[PDB]
């Protein structure tokens, strides 16, 4: 399965999705800079509308514990 095919379900907790992401990211072998680009970009983009909304409110500069606690009720 390709990294672009990794997406969050409509009922799937973000948490279970983030695990899937760094597992697939774990099978990507690209430069770190590209993998940083993938992190800030693709993760949020394939996140579900309800959490996506939430993550837009965190702004930039956000870290994984704060994202992970931010989308917990969703």
């Amino acid at each position: 399965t390709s990294i672009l095919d990794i997406r969050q379900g409509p009922k799937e907790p973000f948490r279970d999705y983030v695990d899937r992401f760094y597992k697939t990211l774990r099978a990507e072998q690209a430069s770190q800079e590209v993998k940083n680009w993938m992190t800030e970009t693709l993760l949020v983009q394939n996140a579900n509308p309800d959490c996506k909304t939430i993550l837009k409110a965190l702004g930039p500069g956000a870290t994984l514990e704060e994202m992970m606690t931010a989308c917990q009720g969703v």
């Binding site: 948490r15 983030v18 695990d19 992401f21 760094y22 990211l25 774990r26 870290t63 994984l64």
Partner: peptide, 10 residues
């Protein structure tokens, strides 16, 4: 536990 493994790395 790759989310955790990444948090640790970082």
């Amino acid at each position: 536990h790759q989310a955790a493994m990444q948090m640790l790395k970082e």
